Ligand binder design. Structure first.
Ligand SMILES: *[C@@H]1O[C@H](CO)[C@@H](O[C@@H]2O[C@H](CO)[C@@H](O[C@@H]3O[C@H](CO[C@H]4O[C@H](CO[C@H]5O[C@H](CO)[C@@H](O)[C@H](O)[C@@H]5O)[C@@H](O)[C@H](O[C@H]5O[C@H](CO)[C@@H](O)[C@H](O)[C@@H]5O)[C@@H]4O)[C@@H](O)[C@H](O[C@H]4O[C@H](CO)[C@@H](O)[C@H](O)[C@@H]4O[C@H]4O[C@H](CO)[C@@H](O)[C@H](O)[C@@H]4O)[C@@H]3O)[C@H](O)[C@H]2NC(C)=O)[C@H](O)[C@H]1NC(C)=O
Ligand SMILES: *[C@@H]1O[C@H](CO)[C@@H](O[C@@H]2O[C@H](CO)[C@@H](O[C@@H]3O[C@H](CO[C@H]4O[C@H](CO[C@H]5O[C@H](CO)[C@@H](O)[C@H](O)[C@@H]5O)[C@@H](O)[C@H](O[C@H]5O[C@H](CO)[C@@H](O)[C@H](O)[C@@H]5O)[C@@H]4O)[C@@H](O)[C@H](O[C@H]4O[C@H](CO)[C@@H](O)[C@H](O)[C@@H]4O[C@H]4O[C@H](CO)[C@@H](O)[C@H](O)[C@@H]4O)[C@@H]3O)[C@H](O)[C@H]2NC(C)=O)[C@H](O)[C@H]1NC(C)=O
Ligand SMILES: *[C@@H]1O[C@H](CO)[C@@H](O[C@@H]2O[C@H](CO)[C@@H](O[C@@H]3O[C@H](CO[C@H]4O[C@H](CO)[C@@H](O)[C@H](O)[C@@H]4O)[C@@H](O)[C@H](O[C@H]4O[C@H](CO)[C@@H](O)[C@H](O)[C@@H]4O[C@H]4O[C@H](CO)[C@@H](O)[C@H](O)[C@@H]4O[C@H]4O[C@H](CO)[C@@H](O)[C@H](O)[C@@H]4O)[C@@H]3O)[C@H](O)[C@H]2NC(C)=O)[C@H](O)[C@H]1NC(C)=O
Ligand SMILES: *[C@@H]1O[C@H](CO)[C@@H](O[C@@H]2O[C@H](CO)[C@@H](O[C@@H]3O[C@H](CO[C@H]4O[C@H](CO)[C@@H](O)[C@H](O)[C@@H]4O)[C@@H](O)[C@H](O[C@H]4O[C@H](CO)[C@@H](O)[C@H](O)[C@@H]4O[C@H]4O[C@H](CO)[C@@H](O)[C@H](O)[C@@H]4O[C@H]4O[C@H](CO)[C@@H](O)[C@H](O)[C@@H]4O)[C@@H]3O)[C@H](O)[C@H]2NC(C)=O)[C@H](O)[C@H]1NC(C)=O
Ligand SMILES: *[C@@H]1O[C@H](CO)[C@@H](O[C@@H]2O[C@H](CO)[C@@H](O[C@@H]3O[C@H](CO)[C@@H](O)[C@H](O[C@H]4O[C@H](CO)[C@@H](O)[C@H](O)[C@@H]4O[C@H]4O[C@H](CO)[C@@H](O)[C@H](O)[C@@H]4O)[C@@H]3O)[C@H](O)[C@H]2NC(C)=O)[C@H](O)[C@H]1NC(C)=O
Ligand SMILES: *[C@@H]1O[C@H](CO)[C@@H](O[C@@H]2O[C@H](CO)[C@@H](O[C@@H]3O[C@H](CO)[C@@H](O)[C@H](O[C@H]4O[C@H](CO)[C@@H](O)[C@H](O)[C@@H]4O[C@H]4O[C@H](CO)[C@@H](O)[C@H](O)[C@@H]4O)[C@@H]3O)[C@H](O)[C@H]2NC(C)=O)[C@H](O)[C@H]1NC(C)=O
Ligand SMILES: *[C@@H]1O[C@H](CO)[C@@H](O[C@@H]2O[C@H](CO)[C@@H](O[C@@H]3O[C@H](CO)[C@@H](O)[C@H](O)[C@@H]3O)[C@H](O)[C@H]2NC(C)=O)[C@H](O)[C@H]1NC(C)=O
Ligand SMILES: *[C@@H]1O[C@H](CO)[C@@H](O[C@@H]2O[C@H](CO)[C@@H](O)[C@H](O)[C@H]2NC(C)=O)[C@H](O)[C@H]1NC(C)=O
Ligand SMILES: *[C@@H]1O[C@H](CO)[C@@H](O[C@@H]2O[C@H](CO)[C@@H](O)[C@H](O)[C@H]2NC(C)=O)[C@H](O)[C@H]1NC(C)=O
Ligand SMILES: *[C@@H]1O[C@H](CO)[C@@H](O[C@@H]2O[C@H](CO)[C@@H](O)[C@H](O)[C@H]2NC(C)=O)[C@H](O)[C@H]1NC(C)=O
Ligand SMILES: *[C@@H]1O[C@H](CO)[C@@H](O[C@@H]2O[C@H](CO)[C@@H](O)[C@H](O)[C@H]2NC(C)=O)[C@H](O)[C@H]1NC(C)=O
Lengths: 447, 132, 132, 447, 132
């Protein structure tokens, strides 16, 4: 009896992959400072983002199979090079460095004298600078060289731009949609009872860090434990905190900028003398707040590893500096902190057997992150003392392979892949394409 | 916006217009004022394939017996071999996601009946009926 | 081309087609043969937003009771609260620029009557009247 | 009774801003010479441009709020860098310059000997060149250097391309429109009685000049006076001439090109010896024609400053060379002329109390226009004597702040912003977007 | 696909739909995943002018008495001065390539009768007939 009929706009979608753009909230543009991070032409966010709750719907999510992460990872990388392209290349800095020990803490800073090319191509320039031990390597008085010269090339980041992370909403073009998991407790895998859709994801600050998730989103109720493959010790374990942990990272060296002239037209910013406290960079963590968090987290691991077992913490095993330390950016400078003091503990079933804690931090201006070869970025010196306060919202953890599986387990801070950092914010999101076209049988026919 | 995807097909016909609107349109008019070689292609590649995917749907709507959006009907008889069912078992008791699942085998077959059996044979039929 | 913008609405209906033509179309087919990274995006940014602005207008034309260009009518009754006027006071004594000025408050309201009250409720009504 | 009806293509537009493209008239492409100025791929102009006169229409125009100017200004700037990108960079020209006084007029030209790098990276090259005094600066025989080396970098313009201005029509994409003011007398502000619309603007030659509008469009009937804020002495006063003023600018030095080889693959064009008249560049203005124009202009200022008052003219007050002199390009070379001789006069109410006049001009090859830092362009030497004849179509003028407002007023040549130069041609144009969609009540209803 | 180009106009009406399909559509969805500054514009310049050439044809279809694809009819009378012929001499004895060859002079004239004499004067006529 019936007849086929074309319906346009039926609620049907399929899992797929597309190219997502950014959103800057249209305030970051007023923040100016000559293109801070991403935002230059970045899309103004809709003042009223739309979230539609889909009733009677259950969708299965996988955060580890999420494609939004891979795009974001490649975005930050592609974003990084484009910031370094118009800037000043430091290529003729590979000149021999004659260094000496600074006037305590085993001479971490080196005072280096070297020959340099002026605006004119005739006479050289005899000038001195100040580099950290991590930025230089001796070659055989004491003679040193740039640490990156044998490995790769080098370019200086522009002082105009800042590395300051600003909220970025990922949105989908016409024909696509983004699903949001509204459950309080979600490990990133399995069906989601309450699912809502949004045009743009929430505010996500692209904070690049290791061993500590900084400035992220807090969990709901109980703290969350996420891992791709849990029983497998080769896979990292992502943790999401409930209450934010106050962390202080400062540069207890009050510095000055030389702004030497290596023309024509180009000017390099050298590190002058340090006027102030003679100290190494340090990181503060409140003993009470970290412990309270640890006690709640250590109970969550026993929802898997069993109600009763011994869980011991220890600092990094070994590897590259990026893996073994906490790496991040504060005030333009790149800190590498020693987390060994926090991870020194041993816990009982429900308990573990002062007013402050500190963590020695090292500074490195010349960096190759993401295992990049051919391009090394020089972090320009900053006038005055840098102070910053951030939230610790999660960790990257690894489990030992030595077993003795039925006895006890030890966990250590992870590192390496930065995709895990983005999976922390993207676990509740995935991309699907909408299929509007549909057919249904009805009596209407036609004349 | 997709709210009835979990609901029955009968209830899903009421909010049909909302899906048509948002899916169909881009009206942000945001960005593209100041040029970039790098990222800009990325915000291009997405919306260019979007309008290509868009005109793709519009073609089927035109070449078939629709010539208009939302709902339109046709002279194609519903085959018994295609989801033999009860009328109340489809709209009232069944959902679109559940529905498209079964028709998956006959979907390409039905498409042929719309463009070939109708607008090729109907418009020619119309030309013969409009002469007299 | 816009010649009747100063003239009355009654006279402005005669040249209506001319505005439709030029506004609708690009047919220059000039440039884009040899590539440039710089300027070329600029001559792109203009015409790309142009076709985006174009399809935006076409959507309203489709989702409403038109489905065709130029003029089309609808079943939406004209509210007294919306520009209470004389018929000869509108077309004969008044101009379009002067006209759109007053309707500015009710413009968003009228738009709703076209997509919701009609093509959502009309097409569903049509489906119920085409069954018998 | 009636019913709503959708009308498509109603004559309704709103003031807005869009991205405008160019038009080259499809002849400039046959002019060839390897991409003269803008025209490379530039759009062929429609052989029959359309101008539609809108009857019974009155539109209010503001030339100072016009957005077409800002785009054109950024266009010429963006056009400039792209011409200099593929060309040869002059970076190793900062070598010390040993100069001496040329064999009259206080040694304006310097004969400079210097060391240079050859195709090979082994042996240098001892060669001499000829630079103007404005292009070099001594540093402490006489030793000099490039004037731009301490300020910025430098690159040489390609000899293939020419700076010759060609007519450029600005047009609008689909969905937009450009309004044209057809009145004979228009100051750029207020309502316009007769308004016409065009797809493309008239022929506009992007001639960059200071203190003199060159190769522009003539006014109708009386000469025009335009200013953003008139009583304000901080705002420049744009003038549009009726009859064109014949002006001659030549390079009375017959030169040769060295075409030295600084390989591999690159070749620089040095300025060889001068064979011919020993002279400084000069600018000719006919005493009769300038005076006649002045007498007509000075009467127009009294339509504002009052019927009776003393109007005195004087040369530039002071500032950058671009501001204090007449700056332009003729034959590829950049002339800077002394206009002090023309602006020396004092006028009575209707009158002022030889067969020719001349103006000393200076030549500068290395230039930074538009206050650009980081990029300096070197104007390549031209074989033979350059002669050019142009129209003077208007001026950039400023009024003194010293008042004594009710006594007398003095006017001096302006400069700086090049947008005013484009406002001279764009005063009658503005961009609006067309709104086709419209609704009207009618009886037709529907079945 | 063009198979009847050599055949008569009468036979060329059967395969008409095939030409409509392929010409109308791009659905390759191939490439554009990883960016290039150079070649990519070239694969852009082709498909961008393609959709511009596409909407150009669709406009004539809309502004005329068609409002739909494939075949549609009109109220424009066939002038004797335009290819005075026999009916069997056109479809049965003549081919499209041979046909468009002669009409080349009157092609621009006929186009005017469709947009001006009809949809400008027909829709206005319709408005006057729909009032009563
Ligand atoms: C995520 O991570 C998790 C962990 O972090 C990963 O889990 C790992 O998954 C792999 C599967 O790829 C497992 O390996 C497989 O183990 C099974 C089972 O082996 C156990 O049981 C055997 C039998 O047990 C019964 O019988 C005894 C006797 O009655 C009883 O007492 C018991 O109680 C049970 O009832 C037993 O024989 C096994 O012991 C042997 O193996 C272990 C482990 O190596 C040794 O320690 C022991 O000494 C002993 O040698 C074990 O206890 C095996 O059956 C699988 O073998 C298949 O695969 C081999 C390749 O790895 C292949 O060489 C074999 O031939 C065999 O293949 C056979 O079976 C296939 C399927 O039917 C056929 O197609 C094939 O042709 C052939 O016939 C395999 O070894 C890991 O154990 C598991 N990890 C842990 C810690 O347990 C997971 O993979 C990860 N996933 C992702 C997506 O990341
Ligand atoms: C384009 O360019 C033009 C010029 O090139 C610009 O024009 C300039 O516009 C500004 C406005 O922003 C003017 O300044 C304003 O002047 C008015 C008027 O001042 C005159 O008249 C006063 C009264 O005159 C009457 O009364 C006497 C006494 O009976 C009679 O004899 C007279 O004949 C009149 O009938 C008089 O008091 C003034 O004299 C004082 O000021 C002058 C100028 O500084 C001095 O020389 C004098 O010695 C004397 O001190 C003058 O003669 C003022 O009223 C304005 O003051 C307001 O703004 C001040 C900030 O600048 C602020 O501090 C004041 O408090 C005051 O604000 C008051 O009024 C506001 C509005 O009601 C209130 O909101 C506010 O709360 C407060 O109550 C102001 O000084 C310039 O004069 C004018 N230029 C010239 C050359 O005249 C134009 O702006 C430009 N535009 C653009 C878009 O580019
Ligand atoms: C995780 O999230 C947290 C929280 O969101 C992040 O912490 C953020 O860190 C940002 C720095 O990276 C910081 O930005 C700062 O904002 C401060 C406040 O700005 C507001 O107040 C001022 C008035 O003081 C308003 O004018 C302004 O509009 C704002 O409303 C600024 O004060 C900061 O500037 C100073 O710090 C930065 C480095 O942190 C320097 O580069 C900068 O130059 C400033 O330092 C000078 O000034 C201070 C005194 O203000 C001097 O003590 C110092 O020595 C410097 O003085 C010398 O140098 C300047 C030129 O540099 C020279 O003029 C002067 O004469 C001296 O020679 C800075 O702009 C965010 O505010 C902060 N978030 C919050 C909520 O506070 C954290 O980074 C995130 N984690 C990661 C990894 O990103
Ligand atoms: C404002 O507007 C005015 C008017 O529009 C602008 O004035 C314009 O200025 C242009 C130059 O910038 C000028 O272009 C010239 O056109 C001349 C005429 O070309 C026509 O005739 C020739 C035949 O003679 C045809 O073949 C041709 O197709 C055209 O139909 C050319 O003769 C000019 O070339 C000479 O001048 C330029 C500089 O002006 C040199 O670069 C060029 O090389 C030429 O100079 C050589 O030739 C002359 C003799 O012709 C010798 O005297 C001279 O020394 C040079 O000879 C040596 O150098 C050459 C290689 O350079 C070498 O082969 C030779 O053997 C020697 O070694 C030039 O092409 C416009 O015509 C002119 N407008 C009008 C209407 O005339 C003014 O610029 C505008 N203002 C601004 C600010 O832009
Ligand atoms: C990382 O750094 C951050 C920022 O420095 C640290 O967070 C700060 O922690 C401090 C101390 O833990 C805290 O300071 C107190 O804040 C109170 C308000 O919340 C203040 O009221 C209080 O001031 C009193 O004490 C000071 C020192 O004793 C006095 O100098 C001051 O004048 C105050 O005394 C007054 O009040 C008493 C009554 O209480 C009255 O009798 C007196 O007359 C007088 O009026 C402290 O300053 C900050 O508030 C914290 N900041 C934030 C943003 O939370 C964090 O602890 C650091 N983390 C680590 C690991 O080091
Ligand atoms: C900027 O430069 C331009 C270009 O040089 C100047 O404009 C030119 O100005 C000159 C003079 O003002 C003018 O030359 C005259 O043009 C006349 C035509 O318009 C010619 O007929 C005339 O030639 C006669 O005079 C010459 C010199 O006396 C003789 O050499 C020549 O043979 C001519 O004589 C003949 O005619 C007489 C009768 O009149 C006859 O008895 C003789 O037998 C013989 O046959 C001049 O050359 C140019 O025409 C102008 N050019 C243009 C394009 O307008 C401008 O003045 C300069 N500006 C400044 C400020 O210096
Ligand atoms: C590690 O976490 C434990 C909790 O598991 C913290 O123990 C806490 O110790 C403080 C004292 O230092 C307790 O405060 C006390 O409160 C009581 C009641 O108000 C009061 O009588 C005491 O005088 C004192 O103020 C606190 O209550 C207690 N925590 C709990 C949950 O009882 C411990 O402080 C943490 N580590 C550190 C750095 O101390
Ligand atoms: C780092 O070493 C340089 C020398 O290479 C120091 O600069 C000298 O400082 C002394 C002060 O004791 C002056 O007398 C010299 O004239 C300086 N020489 C130069 C070349 O600058 C510098 O002081 C050392 N680091 C600092 C600043 O403590
Ligand atoms: C990070 O912290 C740990 C723990 O304090 C440091 O370990 C010390 O290492 C030195 C040798 O370098 C030993 O002499 C100390 O005995 C160790 N301390 C303890 C408590 O065992 C470590 O050196 C710190 N930094 C680095 C870069 O390793
Ligand atoms: C500019 O100075 C150079 C020398 O630096 C002159 O070139 C010399 O000219 C004399 C002629 O009197 C020759 O004998 C020399 O052999 C030339 N030397 C070189 C290195 O070329 C040059 O003549 C001076 N300027 C001009 C050309 O007048
Ligand atoms: C531009 O022209 C004026 C006017 O002739 C020149 O002014 C002369 O300046 C010199 C000093 O450099 C004085 O000795 C003369 O007396 C001035 N002339 C007059 C008539 O007063 C001026 O030098 C010229 N050029 C520049 C660059 O200033």
């Amino acid at each position: 009896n019936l007849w086929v009929t074309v319906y346009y706009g039926v609620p049907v979608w399929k899992d797929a992959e597309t190219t997502l753009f950014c959103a800057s909230d249209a305030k970051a543009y007023e923040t100016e400072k000559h293109n801070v991070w991403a935002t230059h032409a970045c899309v103004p966010t809709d003042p009223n983002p739309q979230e539609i709750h889909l009733e009677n719907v259950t969708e299965e999510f996988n955060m580890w199979k999420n494609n939004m992460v891979e795009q974001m990872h490649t975005d930050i990388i592609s974003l990084w090079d484009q910031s370094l392209k118009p800037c000043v290349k430091l290529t003729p800095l590979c000149v021999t460095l004659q260094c000496t020990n600074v006037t305590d803490m085993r001479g971490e800073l080196k005072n280096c004298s070297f020959n340099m090319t002026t605006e004119l191509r005739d006479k050289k320039q005899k000038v001195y600078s100040l580099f950290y031990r991590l930025d230089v390597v001796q070659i055989n008085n004491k003679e040193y060289r740039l640490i990156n010269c044998n490995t790769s090339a080098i370019t200086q980041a522009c002082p105009k731009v800042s590395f300051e992370p600003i909220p970025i909403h990922y949105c989908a073009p016409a024909g696509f949609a983004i699903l949001k998991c509204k459950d309080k407790k979600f490990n990133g895998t399995g069906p989601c009872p309450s699912v809502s859709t949004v045009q743009c994801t929430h505010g996500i600050k692209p904070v690049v860090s290791t061993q500590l998730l900084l400035n992220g989103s807090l969990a709901e109720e109980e703290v969350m434990i996420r891992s791709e493959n849990i029983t497998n010790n080769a896979k990292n374990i992502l943790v999401q905190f409930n209450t934010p942990v106050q962390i202080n990272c400062t540069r207890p060296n009050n510095n000055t900028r030389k702004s030497i002239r290596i023309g024509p037209g180009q000017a390099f910013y050298a590190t002058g003398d340090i006027i102030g406290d003679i100290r190494q960079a340090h990181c503060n963590v409140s003993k009470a707040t970290w412990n309270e968090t640890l006690g709640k987290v250590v109970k969550q691991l026993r929802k898997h590893f069993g109600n009763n077992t011994i869980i011991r913490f220890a600092n990094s095993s070994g590897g590259d500096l990026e893996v073994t330390t906490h790496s991040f950016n504060c005030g333009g400078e790149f800190f590498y902190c020693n987390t060994s003091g926090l991870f020194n503990s041993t816990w009982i079933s429900n308990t573990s057997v002062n007013d402050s804690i500190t963590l020695p931090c090292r500074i490195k201006q010349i960096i190759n992150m993401w295992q990049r070869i051919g391009q090394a970025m020089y972090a320009p010196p900053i006038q005055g003392v840098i102070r910053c306060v951030s939230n610790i919202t999660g960790l990257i953890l690894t489990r030992d392979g030595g077993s003795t599986n039925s006895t006890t387990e030890t966990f250590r801070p992870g590192g390496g892949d930065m995709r895990d950092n983005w999976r922390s914010e993207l676990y509740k999101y995935k991309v699907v394409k909408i299929e509007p076209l549909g057919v249904a049988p009805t009596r209407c026919k036609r004349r | 916006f997709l709210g009835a995807a979990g609901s029955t097909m009968g209830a899903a016909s009421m909010t049909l217009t909302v899906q048509a609107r948002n899916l169909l349109s881009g009206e942000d008019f945001t960005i593209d004022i100041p040029d970039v070689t790098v990222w800009g292609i990325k915000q291009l590649q997405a919306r260019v394939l979007a309008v290509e995917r868009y005109l793709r749907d519009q073609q089927l709507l035109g070449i078939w017996g629709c010539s208009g959006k939302l709902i339109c009907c046709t002279n194609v008889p519903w085959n018994s071999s295609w989801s033999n069912r009860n009328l109340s078992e489809i709209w009232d008791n069944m959902t679109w996601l559940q529905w498209d699942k079964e028709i998956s085998n006959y979907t390409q077959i039905i498409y042929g009946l719309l463009e070939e059996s109708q607008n090729q044979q109907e418009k020619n039929e119309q030309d013969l009926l409009a002469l007299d």
